Amino acid sequence: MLKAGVHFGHQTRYWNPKMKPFIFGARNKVHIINLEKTVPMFNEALAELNKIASRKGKILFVGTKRAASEAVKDAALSCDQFFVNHRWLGGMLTNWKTVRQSIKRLKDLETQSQDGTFDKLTKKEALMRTRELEKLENSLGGIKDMGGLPDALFVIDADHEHIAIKEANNLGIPVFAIVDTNSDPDGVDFVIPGNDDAIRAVTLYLGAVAATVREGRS
Amino acid sequence: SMQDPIADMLTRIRNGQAANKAAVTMPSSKLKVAIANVLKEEGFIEDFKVEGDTKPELELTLKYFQGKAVVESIQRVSRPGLRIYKRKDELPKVMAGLGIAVVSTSKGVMTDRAARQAGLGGEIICYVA
Amino acid sequence: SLSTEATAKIVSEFGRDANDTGSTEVQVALLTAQINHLQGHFAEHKKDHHSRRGLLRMVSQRRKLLDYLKRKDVARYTQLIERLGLRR
RNA sequence: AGGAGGUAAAAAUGCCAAG
RNA sequence: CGUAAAGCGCACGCAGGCGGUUUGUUAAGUCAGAUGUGAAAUCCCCGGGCUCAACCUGGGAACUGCAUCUGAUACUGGCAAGCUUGAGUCUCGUAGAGGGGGGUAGAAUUCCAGGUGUAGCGGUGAAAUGCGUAGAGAUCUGGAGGAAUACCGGUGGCGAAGGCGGCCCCCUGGACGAAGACUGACGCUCAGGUGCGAAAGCGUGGGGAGCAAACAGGAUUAGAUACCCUGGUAGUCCACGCCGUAAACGAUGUCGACUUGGAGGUUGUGCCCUUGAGGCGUGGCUUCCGGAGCUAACGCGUUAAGUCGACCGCCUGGGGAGUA
């Protein structure tokens, strides 16, 4: 049942037929989700998220969508977790040993152009050191305090971040994805039927999981 | 033109388990309701029932253990183009005896293991290992 | 063809009553009336190959019903074929 | 979005090469 | 067996194979048991003997079979009675280049005649052959002919396939739908058989505008028996026979069942507020994309090349050869 507003269903008539278990077809040719079928779904996910947090896990907050990037940043930063919000680099989990080389360049440049040599050289390449830093701080921004692999992933759209999902189950990492009526639920280990592209919907989703992980340090 | 209703029954179970349908309905028959009882007592299906009086409807609720079917294979051995009868001593063991073969003996349909200890053979219907 | 009152004449002659319209004696007689009617059509045109395929379908369907009727009830079969003049 | 054209829209010839 | 070799061009069908559902009966198939037999030797098993082994030998099993007897009756068959879903009939409508016959319409090409009118026309990459002062081409009027049906026109429709486009009538086939009634398994497939079967071709008799094999002339070219140009007979058209082939192709046999979806086209129909082009359903046919699955891959994908069943056709390295 609605503890909130807009999380009821979306995205059109056209739909993934693997999510027929969580649907009502509304009169505006827009499928709406069985909310009493997904309310026990994500509190089951909140049961497992608080357990992974209680064994001091590292939880990734992946989802870009150009309209929830600003909110998923504040989700993992209100707690002590990690996130991506700009373009998820294809390979940053399965090929993590060469993305480890790229955060070290970011962690170098956050000392080079910040406090070390920033004006001690030519002015053009000094801007290039900041130009390289500004495209590394959005791609590998929330990952520089990692240094292992994450213990879980929290995706906000499954069909838009299938690359992250395919990389997660290619390892042993479980996922908690907010799947929508057009997205695929088979790659997901903890299917959460809900709206994906609504800013009030996601702040309920990221707000609940950031609240759930910040009882995990007890 | 529907010349084997028994192979149509196993095909509906096979396609129903592949499509992850929870239940399979088919036109009932006295032989279909017999070999459905063999699958229910052996653990391949659950809770078969017959609804109807003049055009009865056999309905079987399929079985799943984890995200996978229970009947991995369900073949039909004595099709109407080629009937297969076996004696008592050459009744087949299917998948080394951990999958059954439905044989129609003169004491009704039973598994191959049941027909050996009963001591008689008959027309073998299906390998539902 | 075989207009609606002409079929009404046949269905009352051969069946039990007027709504009895699907029995073998009715259908065999009803096809034979159409087959005999189309003889004048093909004594004429003779190159209507597309319409003759419908005629051979009516001939072969009549023979299948008579071969059904001779197996079930040979009394009604011999009464039927003398009633229309069949069995060459 | 499909349709039609546009000094314009082509069409002259142009073979062979071996273990 | 889509493309590697391989689905008859397509139907209709006899023999044949197969057959929905319920009860009874029969006990042929089937199953169980027994009896007789299945020669001995070999083969196999457990033994015995040659100093071991080969070899020899005792006993047993086996000889998968056949026949009779006595049982079993689930399945298959037989017989009897049914049942309604398969198949079929009737009533009522709908759509359609389905077929056969007979009429008729307008546009254009060519020819014929005439008026006007003046040196070109036609053609090409460019030319020439050709046509034109005997007056063409252009234009206008009148006529005679034959053939094809612009626009509609649409991965639109219909047909078993080949195929089928102006309009109108006559004769006629099939499909589909709604709501009922009726028959009661009448079904599916089909070797041989029979029928249909583009175009080219053949026979006889017509017809002949336009195109056009052959052929001729002009070009092009090293040559040009070609492409290109100017002509042009058979043929293309009609009637009636014949041929019986095609990349006759979705290179995919027919029939039935089952198995996520999306966007369309087309043609029915139900219900509701038709209130208005809507809304909700439900059938038939059809195009495209795509999931599982399948596939060597390409791809196919509820119209399967998926999962199955019934029957048929066919394939077995390339060439020789679909030839003698």
Swiss-Prot record, chain A:
Q: What does this protein do?
A: Required for ribosomal protein bS1 (rpsA) to bind to the 30S subunit.
* Protein family according to the UniProt entry: Belongs to the universal ribosomal protein uS2 family.
PTM-bearing positions, type N6-succinyllysine: 107
Instruction: Give the signal sequence positions.
Output: none
Q: Which GO BP terms, alphabetically?
A: cytoplasmic translation; ribosomal small subunit assembly
**Superkingdom of origin organism:** Bacteria
Q: Which UniProt keywords apply?
A: Ribonucleoprotein, Ribosomal protein
Classification lineage: Bacteria, Pseudomonadati, Pseudomonadota, Gammaproteobacteria, Enterobacterales
Quaternary data = Part of the 30S ribosomal subunit, contacts bS1. Some nascent polypeptide chains are able to cross-link to this protein in situ. In collided ribosomes contacts ribosome rescue factor SmrB.
Hydrolase in keyword set: no
- Per the record, the coiled-coil ranges are none
Membrane spanning stretches = none
Q: Under which name does UniProt file this protein?
A: Small ribosomal subunit protein uS2
* Claim: rRNA-binding is one of the keywords in the record: no
Give me the Gene Ontology terms describing cellular component: cytoplasm; cytosolic small ribosomal subunit
Output the PANTHER family linked to this UniProt entry.
Answer: 30S RIBOSOMAL PROTEIN S2 PROKARYOTIC AND ORGANELLAR, SMALL RIBOSOMAL SUBUNIT PROTEIN US2M
Name one molecular function that GO assigns to this entry: structural constituent of ribosome
Curated annotation (Swiss-Prot), chain B:
Q: Which SUPFAM superfamilies match?
A: Ribosomal protein S8 (SSF56047)
Q: Does the keyword Ribosomal protein apply?
A: yes
Q: Which InterPro entries would you find in this protein's record? A: Ribosomal_uS8 (IPR000630), Ribosomal_uS8_CS (IPR047863), Ribosomal_uS8_sf (IPR035987)
Mind naming one GO cellular-component term on file for this protein? cytosol
- Please give a single GO biological process term from the UniProt record: regulation of mRNA stability
The family database entries (PROSITE patterns) matched by this protein are listed as: RIBOSOMAL_S8 (PS00053)
What Pfam families has UniProt attached to this entry? Answer: Ribosomal_S8
Sorted alphabetically, the keyword list is:
Repressor, Ribonucleoprotein, Ribosomal protein, RNA-binding, rRNA-binding, Translation regulation
Q: Which domain of life is it from?
A: Bacteria
Q: Name one GO molecular function term.
A: structural constituent of ribosome
Q: Does RNA-binding count among this protein's keywords?
A: yes
Question: What does the annotation say about its assembly with partners?
Answer: Part of the 30S ribosomal subunit. Contacts proteins S5 and S12.
- What does the record give as the function of this protein? One of the primary rRNA binding proteins, it binds directly to 16S rRNA central domain where it helps coordinate assembly of the platform of the 30S subunit. Protein S8 is a translational repressor protein, it controls the translation of the spc operon by binding to its mRNA.
Question: What's this protein's family per the entry?
Answer: Belongs to the universal ribosomal protein uS8 family.
From the Swiss-Prot or TrEMBL record, give the protein name: Small ribosomal subunit protein uS8
Lineage per the UniProt record: Bacteria, Pseudomonadati, Pseudomonadota, Gammaproteobacteria, Enterobacterales
UniProtKB/Swiss-Prot annotation, chain C:
User: What upregulates it?
Assistant: Part of the metY operon that extends to pnp, also has its own promoter.
Keywords, alphabetical: Ribonucleoprotein, Ribosomal protein, RNA-binding, rRNA-binding, Translation regulation
| GO MF entry, a single one | small ribosomal subunit rRNA binding
The keyword rRNA-binding appears for this protein? yes
Q: Where is the signal peptide?
A: none
- Example of a GO biological process term: ribosomal small subunit assembly
Q: Which domain of life is it from?
A: Bacteria
**Gene Ontology cellular component annotations, sorted alphabetically:** cytoplasm; cytosol; cytosolic small ribosomal subunit
Q: Which InterPro entries match?
A: Ribosomal_uS15, Ribosomal_uS15_bac-type, uS15_NS1_RNA-bd_sf
Q: Which Pfam families match?
A: Ribosomal_S15
Coiled-coil stretches are none
Briefly state the protein's biological role: One of the primary rRNA binding proteins, it binds directly to 16S rRNA where it helps nucleate assembly of the platform of the 30S subunit by binding and bridging several RNA helices of the 16S rRNA. Binds to its own mRNA, stabilizing it 5-UTR and preventing its translation. In the E.coli 70S ribosome it has been modeled to contact the 23S rRNA of the 50S subunit forming part of bridge B4. In the two 3.5 A resolved ribosome structures there are minor differences between side-chain conformations.
On assembly, the entry states: Part of the 30S ribosomal subunit. Forms a bridge to the 50S subunit in the 70S ribosome, contacting the 23S rRNA.
Record family assignment: Belongs to the universal ribosomal protein uS15 family.
The protein in question is named Small ribosomal subunit protein uS15
Organism of origin: Escherichia coli (strain K12)
Gene behind the chain: rpsO
